[PDB]
Amino acid sequence: SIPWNLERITPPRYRSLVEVYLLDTSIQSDHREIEGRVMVTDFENVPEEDASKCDSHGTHLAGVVSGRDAGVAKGASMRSLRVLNCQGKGTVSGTLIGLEFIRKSQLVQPVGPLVVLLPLAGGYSRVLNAACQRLARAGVVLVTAAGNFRDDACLYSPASAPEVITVGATNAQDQPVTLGTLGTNFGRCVDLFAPGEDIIGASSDCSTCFVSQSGTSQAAAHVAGIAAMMLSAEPELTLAELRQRLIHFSAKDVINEAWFPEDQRVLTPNLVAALPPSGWQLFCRTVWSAHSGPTRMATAIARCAPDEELLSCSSFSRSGKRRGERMEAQGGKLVCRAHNAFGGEGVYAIARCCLLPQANCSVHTAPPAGTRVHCHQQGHVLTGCSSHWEVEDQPNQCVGHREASIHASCCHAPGLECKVKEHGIQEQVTVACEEGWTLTGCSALPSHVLGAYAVDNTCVVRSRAVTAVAICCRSR
Amino acid sequence: TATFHRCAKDPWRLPGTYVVVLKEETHLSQSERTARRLQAQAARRGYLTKILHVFHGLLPGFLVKMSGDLLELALKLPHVDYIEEDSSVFAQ
């Protein structure tokens, strides 16, 4: 009796002050699933066309989010804006106006936390991304479709907007939806996946009908309902706190990554959304750069969100022709920068981004001689090690080869306990933090390392006599 | 300093309508003035314009329906940050 998708997101233990806005087609607001809980707004901005069709898409999604019988957040108050016409087409400009409309309604009649579901995509849009970013700065939570083109999400908007939660689609077998040349978008702009194929929900065909639809919007609607419920339970969550918790509570490594193109496999988060089980914990996430160009001086950058701290920095290139990485200040924030090498096709920079208030952090460098630095005090903790070089070919202390410069991430956080865990043996070596601990830094001890990156709480080092080093922390 | 952007996926482009985005501190009264300024200038060249919407709240700026020939003119207007040609979004 329970739809696979509602079951898939239920955690191992389980049992209206939030509003979810919906920008979509028209809504049959008096369908049984959503009747009385959806308010049609008086906003409409659609391009001209070139009655059951017209409200099918929006009706199904409102259903997935808030439906009495088949919905994720069954007790969810919703508000609809019409921005897609009957063929499901809208404009960037009409969407802007709708998003503007939301902020205005907020200013003139505030309620509680707002979630905005954006079940649509066009190509990368500068202005649409910017609008989303401001709406996020204003304290609003945005959830969007990764897009349906079996392509890189960074090429689509609002999917590419960094401040918005971008959601890809998985099927009943937990695999990325594929269909011919179409299917879920993927890549580094995707934050997580959710059920998005064969999804039961309200059909606009009649007041009591249900239909099965599929799309990254359906995947996105699941995340919006989960977010609605997370915010009902803890309304003071900021976006950044909310995003980290979605990642933390997702199922991990249930996606077979061979479904993605080779070069997107490490970039694409292996996460299928789930409701959290129902005092303070250390949350971290890994942020990947776009691939740099193949020029020598090409570099890649990875950044954290405004309220996150960059706790460690690594790099990777599948040929291994790279010159490592370094943490450098930029606009007041630590940023992680990776270096390409001569003959190298380009490299990735890989950041570990965490929610750690009550903390100041700095980078400590020693130049080549191997080479060492440390965090020179107590209750001030080493969270990450980076290493870069100009050539081509120990508690609280980082060490790297003698021809390399070396960098330590040092944080003031006396509430934190950290331990360094090593393991070595050979294409790949991994070491994981024990349960309750959070991976803050991942590196390789100085054979030939392609690179290293954190995957959830597991440090991965790729090689072609190799040891992986994990820094692990928790609150005490 | 003012840049122009149109969608890289050609079939999704919607030429003829443009989102003009002004610098961040720009007050609504200036946004509207600047829209009227552009209208004036375009009229002196026998181009017809229609200001569809003036934005304030998230971004300052306005929505304009006008020939692309005026883009160079529009880009010289005081306060302009960048201009983006409208384009399509689709149900996902």
Binding site: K53, S56, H57, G88, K89, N148, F149, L179, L182, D198, V211, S212, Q213, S214, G215, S217 | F90, A91, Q92
Partner: peptide
């Protein structure tokens, strides 16, 4: 009905 053509571009 699975991938309704109501979703772009299924």
């Amino acid at each position: 009905x699975x991938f309704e053509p109501t979703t772009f571009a299924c």
